[PDB]
Design a binder for this molecule. Sequence first.
Ligand code: HPA
Ligand code: HPA
Ligand code: HPA
Lengths: 282, 282, 282
Amino acid sequence: MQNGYTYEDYQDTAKWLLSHTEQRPQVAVICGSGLGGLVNKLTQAQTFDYSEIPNFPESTVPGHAGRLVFGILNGRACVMMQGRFHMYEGYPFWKVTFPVRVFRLLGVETLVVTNAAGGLNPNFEVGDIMLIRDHINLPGFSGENPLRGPNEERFGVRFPAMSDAYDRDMRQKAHSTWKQMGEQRELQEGTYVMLGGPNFETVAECRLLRNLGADAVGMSTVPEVIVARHCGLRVFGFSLITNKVIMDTESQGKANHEEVLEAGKQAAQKLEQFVSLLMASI
Amino acid sequence: MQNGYTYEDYQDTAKWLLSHTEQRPQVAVICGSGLGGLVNKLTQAQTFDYSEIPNFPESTVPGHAGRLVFGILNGRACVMMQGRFHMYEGYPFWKVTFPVRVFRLLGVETLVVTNAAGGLNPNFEVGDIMLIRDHINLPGFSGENPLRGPNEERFGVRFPAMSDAYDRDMRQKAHSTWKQMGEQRELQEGTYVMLGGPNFETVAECRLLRNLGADAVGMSTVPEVIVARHCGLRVFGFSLITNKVIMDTESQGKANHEEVLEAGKQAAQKLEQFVSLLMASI
Amino acid sequence: MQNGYTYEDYQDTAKWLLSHTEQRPQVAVICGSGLGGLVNKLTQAQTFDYSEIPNFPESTVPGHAGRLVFGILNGRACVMMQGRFHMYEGYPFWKVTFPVRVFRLLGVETLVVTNAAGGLNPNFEVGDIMLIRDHINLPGFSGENPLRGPNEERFGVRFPAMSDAYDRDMRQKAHSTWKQMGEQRELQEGTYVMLGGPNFETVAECRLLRNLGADAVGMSTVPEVIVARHCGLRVFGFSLITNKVIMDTESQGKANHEEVLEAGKQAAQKLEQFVSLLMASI
Ligand code: HPA
Ligand code: HPA
Ligand code: HPA
């Protein structure tokens, strides 16, 4: 497999955006979970529907419509993705990660990724926020990788390292900010594992995922982090623990989509003020 | 990747079958192992070669020729697949699972899946029958999934759960029936793990498969169970332990295809009467 | 997926080579690591650029240019691949493994595979040579396999076993030869695990790889061993431990490509005399 986008494609899209807005973001945020409401706190916001931006992959976002929003959040200029793309919709990883490279060409230096995730770690409770310290890329093990194919030297090297993908200083700042918020629940931190989806895991799969050392499971984010790190973007991210995974055959029930949506709704306010405060420390 | 079959394709195939047979099955059986002979016990059987049914994937079945057989088994009306499709032949998962959706549109409510498998659990002996209680989907981890691409709402939801894939009541009935058969060997039950194939595993791979909690290994069934559960089919299945996997470098030999064929042959009669008795309890 | 090469394609390429050289090799060597210099010790060498050989996949080799070299090494006639293909470049496994089948049709009976690898086993030091005793094929778990699609009976069987892939007698000879070289460091031996790449692993991924029982990690060799064993080639291989993987968050640094190149350079002489001596015992 080879990326279908030439360097010029990215550049054209970037040039189109610059000629249609006066905003010049330094931070890019890919919203997941109940963070979709974060667009409501931007100043001087300007919205672009994914369908009107050349080369942008078609939208297929549930709940939060596919919009790219520019604006000032807590004194910082940023651009946000309201709705992202997932492999389970049929998109190749090179379409999924297309926005990350455009962000780089706009002058962006920092990327914040957020998502909803199932809790594998027995100590996580619904509503918990887990800073992503590391990740396990299952699709990557089989070759499914956004960097597969010839390397574009103008973006980065052939063999980029990922052991330092999640910025250390960012996670330090995140802990201080959380303390300053006077939260009773502590800020979690752990390993996120991505798998394809769209179906939810079985008990047997959840037990091995946990045995492999993962704390949370999800169907996104990893390909974006890989491409971001490839082109030199400082990356920071976190998962909203939307549900605890069923790990015993005496299943009290089963993970459902309404459950995760509710969680995203109930924690929205907490996630928004958190990301807003973090802007001041980037 | 996206499924190449539109909902209408499935419906056309279903409509063609209904206009060519008076049979109206409630149960669908996908035969594997030595269960291929089960067609010999149907009453009022009517056979359809896969090649004469519109939209049906081309046949590539070894030993048992690709036929779709309708008939009455122990008083119940059912349809059976004599030979299935495997990813290792080159078929995408959406071709492999095509029959499952057609079955749904015919009015079928229950699906019984059977296969041959290598024993990972040290307590299994050749000839053992293992009820499938749960599964581990390795291809699914990388995104290889029959549901990949846009979701067809007329079949099911975007994020179906799989923790309850193998019907509980069915497995209870299976245990009672086995007792009533006066078998000396006990009915096994466990986790089946699917991988792509077509080559057999190495010692190192078998040890990790076992460490991951799998009891039996095979190259099929899982994609069919996923699609079946997606559209609301009650699923029940079992593996015929055709051989015990080599797990030490002092390999007494190596898994071979003739070995598995022999096992399927020697247990044929036992599997047939078992599935026949189960019909009375569905 | 299905192999795009017909049996005749392989045969044509083989026939073209035979009509352009008088050499008739019995051993084929696929050079990796600092073994790229091994071509300098061939007698009566004759070089073919991959681009001039019909049907040969396009070259994309870093450092060592894609050449196929025929010659006599320590009294034995052999053919060597200076530079191989990797999935991470965009090649399907059937393009990657194309040379292995051509080698078979030339009359070759033995294949020696070498590569660079990251050390997972805590006892390995940079510069170590690890005989490959077994392998773990992650891409294979998801269906990514060079044998996927219809089986070509003229090459081998539908379900080949892999538990005996690495020749036992070859590894015995390798140990004797190493002793005869009077090396202070002992010859290592272990399980190689392949993943897609091109990015390097994260700490979390390295810990699970090690927990799964792997000793060394790399991005090649496995598909070639599978196809070789399929067509009846005696296989022998080893990894040059070019670096030790970062397995703690207090990362002293991070794996980089220059590091691995340096290692390949520093051990070149030792690998060359080793492979040269082994020729005398094949
Ligand atoms: O349980 C889950 N599994 C997979 N992805 C998820 N995303 C939110 N919750 C889950
Ligand atoms: O040992 C085995 N491995 C994989 N698939 C199998 N199907 C039957 N036996 C086996
Ligand atoms: O650390 C490593 N990881 C993956 N492949 C490698 N090939 C050499 N070193 C490495």
